[PDB]
Nucleic acid binder design. Structure first.
Ligand SMILES: Nc1nc2c(ncn2[C@H]2C[C@H](O)[C@@H](COP(=O)(O)OP(=O)(O)[C@H](F)P(=O)(O)O)O2)c(=O)[nH]1
Ligand SMILES: [Cl-]
Ligand SMILES: [Cl-]
Ligand SMILES: [Cl-]
Ligand SMILES: [Cl-]
Ligand SMILES: [Cl-]
Ligand SMILES: [Mg+2]
Ligand code: NA
Ligand code: NA
Ligand code: NA
Length: 326
DNA sequence: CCGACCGCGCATCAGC
DNA sequence: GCTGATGCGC
DNA sequence: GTCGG
């Protein structure tokens, strides 16, 4: 937070471009800038100093001067004053409601928490659950609770089949003292890039977790990706914990490393690394790293036996999880 | 300039 | 039913 | 909104 004022401003701007303007590239532009600046080990003294960093162009440079000078940005002040932008921004905070749905709702006169509640009829399943736990999903999860959640998940998975391997990724794997949710990578020997010898692999796990009342709701669920809600069990007479978002990703056992690299993130770190890969002539997804041919087409998967091998391919020194928080 | 900006699973819809 | 595009999210 | 060729 050495330059918290600036990164917050930029993040607010990114959110604006994304939710209201629906200008995803501008959104990422602001995010990257915010990211490179949050990483800057100095208290920025001017937009010019900031422009030296890659990702900070002329536009952001001027805004940083305005911010440093007056402690604010007129562009944002006006944005906050605009009722439609504010309503749209607010609705996009409900899981399941994106820029389009948000603007649509606002067009229908549905602009507040109260409006959503008296209009469940107009929401799809995901949006419905997102509204239900609106407040809870806003809360952070202390690492202490992430540790309790981890323990339940690994043990419950073990009970279903001893060969399952569940790895908690996301900010948790990066050493964060608090996480926005829980991310679980799952593998089983019977499921490889080569074949699927057992059906319902992800289902059995989800099922077991619902059985012990850890998983409470489902936002979306497929053969390899579960997106839902969970809650730690509370003791007698004590207030129950907030409900939490949980994502479970089943990846081919032989593609673990690409999978854990992907799920560990951060999201921006992934974007930068994938972008660098391309420049180096490779393409990286959660399953493999493949070279790009002369035609610019993905070739066959390259051999990977550790997260480091992926880093070596694109000529990047290895970065531990804790240093990938961009 | 000007195009590139990561890559993909699930839910939903239109069009057949 | 299917396929493909879109929205949304990670 | 920013960057590289
Ligand atoms: N390539 C790519 N990868 C993405 C993207 N979004 C999320 N990811 C990856 C990396 C996250 O760590 C991981 C989990 O997604 P996440 O949204 O839970 O992020 P996270 O790192 O856990 C956050 F810090 P928190 O949840 O604690 O607030 O999913 C994306 O847009 N592109
Ligand atoms: Cl854009
Ligand atoms: Cl401001
Ligand atoms: Cl791998
Ligand atoms: Cl692949
Ligand atoms: Cl680490
Ligand atoms: Mg997470
Ligand atoms: Na710059
Ligand atoms: Na949302
Ligand atoms: Na998540």
């Amino acid at each position: 937070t050495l330059n918290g004022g600036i990164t917050d401003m930029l993040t607010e701007l990114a959110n604006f471009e994304k939710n209201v303007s629906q200008a995803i590239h501008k959104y990422n532009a602001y995010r990257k800038a915010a990211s490179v600046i949050a990483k800057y080990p100095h208290k920025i003294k001017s937009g010019a100093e900031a422009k030296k960093l890659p990702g900070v162009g002329t536009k952001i440079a001027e805004k940083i001067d305005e911010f440093l000078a007056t402690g604010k940005l007129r562009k944002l002040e006006k944005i906050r004053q605009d009722d439609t932008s504010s309503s749209i921004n607010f609705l996009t905070r409900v899981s399941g409601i994106g820029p389009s749905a948000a603007r649509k709702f606002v067009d229908e006169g549905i602009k507040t928490l109260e409006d959503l509640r008296k209009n469940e009829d107009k929401l799809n399943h995901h949006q419905r659950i997102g509204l239900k736990y609106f407040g809870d999903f806003e809360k952070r999860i202390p690492r202490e609770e992430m540790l309790q959640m981890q323990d339940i998940v690994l043990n419950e998975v073990k009970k279903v089949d001893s060969e399952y391997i569940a790895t908690v990724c996301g900010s948790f794997r990066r050493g964060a003292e608090s996480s926005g949710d829980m991310d679980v990578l799952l593998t089983h020997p019977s499921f490889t890039s080569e074949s699927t010898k057992q059906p319902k692999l992800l289902h059995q796990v989800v099922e077991q977790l619902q059985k012990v009342h850890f998983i409470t709701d489902t936002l979306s669920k497929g053969e390899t990706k579960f997106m839902g809600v969970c809650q730690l069990p509370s003791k007698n007479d004590e207030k129950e914990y907030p409900h939490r978002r949980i994502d479970i990703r089943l990846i081919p056992k032989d593609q673990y490393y690409c999978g854990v690299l992907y799920f560990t993130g951060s999201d921006i770190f992934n974007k930068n690394m994938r972008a660098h890969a391309l420049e180096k002539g490779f393409t990286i997804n959660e399953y493999t790293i493949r070279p790009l041919g002369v035609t610019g087409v993905a070739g066959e998967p390259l051999p990977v036996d550790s997260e480091k091998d992926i880093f070596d391919y694109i000529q990047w020194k290895y970065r531990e999880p804790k240093d990938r928080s961009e």
